[PDB]
């Protein structure tokens, strides 16, 4: 009976983060997951923009990037379907033709501004060849506080997991989960709702069963790491892959099968306190991203969190094509963008109709 007085925060059960932003984070996460709404992911790096601009022959300049963001962000009415926008660092500081910074434009329209805060993929070194970690925790707090100060209220950080030969190394499962959990708590300390994105990539010849097993294993470890690092669950979101066949598998799945495999996997791992899942569209067509989300919102399986979208190409492909990089295509590009946003809004509600889409 040797005893000692300790701080509660030195005891294992008292590891939960204490952040003065807790109430605001919870309110933001609720706004981001409003019924009928999802996120526009507009956080392509300058390198991604060259890919986006390749088809329309628009040169990759800071001004052209601004105009591509403006196509979507200066589009009247998108706030009916979009609750939040993930910006790139460059765009956070750019101005709309309204004279406002993009974050100020968003806030005026009731849309939450967010920021992609990771610093990109690098070789994992441990594990197997081709596996990747994500850089960016050094100087994270200073960066995140600066983004909060210009009006951002959520952030996004992407880790990826590459299925090869039916599996992924335990090294990548552990290390990427630890990275995401550390990112999430540092974000919350600085007043940003973290979107935790553990993307099991569509690339490869694996089938949907393999995607399900790998996704379940990867995401369970992300959840375990989030408990260990003390995340405020109620102020966090998940941005996962849907569970689908690999892109080179030659296997096709119906919308109902994708929904069943995806939702059963999330239901096995994801605490109901987490307010929402914002699916990435990664490699699905525009229409499939809508059909699949809609099937999830008609699933009879347990799904206490909001299931919505955080879409980049699935919101923008038709829009970019109709825009053509020209001021004369702005109207047609916005009509295509607004059509996709409305389809995804209906999909969130489970009321999307494929025949109306075509």
């Amino acid at each position, epitope marked *: 009976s040797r005893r000692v007085e300790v701080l509660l925060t030195q005891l294992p059960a008292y590891n939960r983060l204490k952040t003065p932003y807790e109430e605001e984070l919870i309110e933001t996460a609720k706004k981001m997951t409003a019924p009928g709404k999802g996120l526009l992911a507009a956080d392509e790096s300058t390198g991604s923009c060259s890919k986006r601009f390749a088809g329309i022959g628009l040169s990759n300049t800071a001004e052209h990037r601004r105009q591509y963001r403006a196509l979507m962000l200066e589009c*009247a009415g998108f706030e009916q379907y979009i609750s939040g926008v993930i910006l790139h660092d460059e765009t956070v500081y750019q101005r709309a033709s309204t004279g406002e910074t993009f974050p100020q434009l968003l806030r005026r329209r009731g849309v939450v501004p967010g920021i992609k805060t990771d610093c990109g993929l690098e070789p994992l070194v441990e594990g197997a060849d081709g596996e990747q970690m994500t850089a960016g925790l050094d100087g994270y707090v200073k960066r995140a506080k600066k983004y909060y100060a210009v009006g951002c209220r959520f952030c996004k950080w992407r880790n990826v997991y590459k299925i090869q030969n039916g599996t992924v190394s335990e090294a990548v499962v552990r290390f990427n989960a630890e990275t995401l959990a550390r990112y999430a708590v540092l974000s919350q300390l600085c007043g940003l709702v973290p979107i935790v994105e553990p993307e099991v990539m569509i690339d490869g010849t694996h089938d949907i069963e393999t995607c399900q097993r790998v996704s379940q294993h990867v995401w369970a470890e992300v959840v375990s790491a989030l408990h260990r690092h003390g995340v405020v669950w109620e102020g966090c979101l998940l941005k996962p892959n849907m569970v689908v066949p690999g892109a080179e598998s030659g296997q096709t799945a119906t919308a109902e099968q994708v929904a069943e495999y995806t939702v059963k996997t999330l239901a096995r791992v994801l605490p109901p306190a987490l307010p929402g899942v914002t699916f990435l569209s990664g490699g699905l067509s525009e229409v499939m991203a809508s059909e699949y989300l809609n099937a999830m919102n008609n699933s009879p399986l347990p799904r206490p969190w909001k299931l919505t979208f955080s879409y980049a190409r699935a919101l923008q492909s038709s829009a970019i094509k109709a825009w053509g990089g020209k001021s004369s295509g702005v109207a047609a590009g916005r009509r295509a963008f607004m059509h996709r946003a409305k389809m995804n809004s209906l999909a969130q509600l489970g009321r999307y109709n494929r025949g109306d889409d075509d």
Partner: nanobody
Framework: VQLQESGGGLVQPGGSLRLSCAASETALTYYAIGWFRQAPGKEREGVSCISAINSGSGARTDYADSVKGRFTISRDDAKNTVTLQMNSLEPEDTARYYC??????????????????????????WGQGTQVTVSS
């Protein structure tokens, strides 16, 4: 989506018409809205526009020089309608009239207000239009 124009008809010089623009599946509240017309042999041209509503001071409006003082645009966000009152009609007002939504968020932050333009470049969702004929 399309908007739906109505209220067209035949009137004599000096007469009046009230055009109505209805949206059945879109919340007009988020948009500046324009009325346009296309006379025989001419391109479609802006007649009138009305901005999103500004708190306290109400919507701003604009008009083509040819119709200033004769036409009044107004909007009802509760009934989801925009109206064009046309007075003192002349033969030269004969045209098919169309309403359309501006796809641009027309906010001017330096002046703190929503505005609108008569230029058709950023508008979309043109309805089938409504015919207005002015003659004896």
């Amino acid at each position: 989506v399309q908007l739906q124009e109505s209220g067209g008809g035949l009137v004599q010089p000096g007469g009046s018409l009230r055009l109505s623009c209805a949206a059945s599946e879109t919340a007009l509240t988020y948009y500046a809205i324009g009325w346009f017309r296309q006379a025989p042999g001419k391109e479609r041209e802006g007649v009138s526009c009305i901005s999103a509503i500004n708190s306290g001071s109400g919507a701003r409006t604009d008009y083509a020089d040819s119709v200033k003082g004769r036409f009044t645009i107004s909007r009802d966000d509760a009934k989801n309608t925009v109206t064009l009152q046309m007075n003192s009609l002349e033969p030269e007002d004969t045209a098919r009239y169309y309403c359309a939504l501006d796809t641009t968020d027309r906010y001017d932050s330096a002046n703190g207000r929503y505005y609108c333009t008569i230029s058709s470049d950023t508008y979309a969702y043109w309805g089938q239009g409504t015919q207005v004929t002015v003659s004896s």
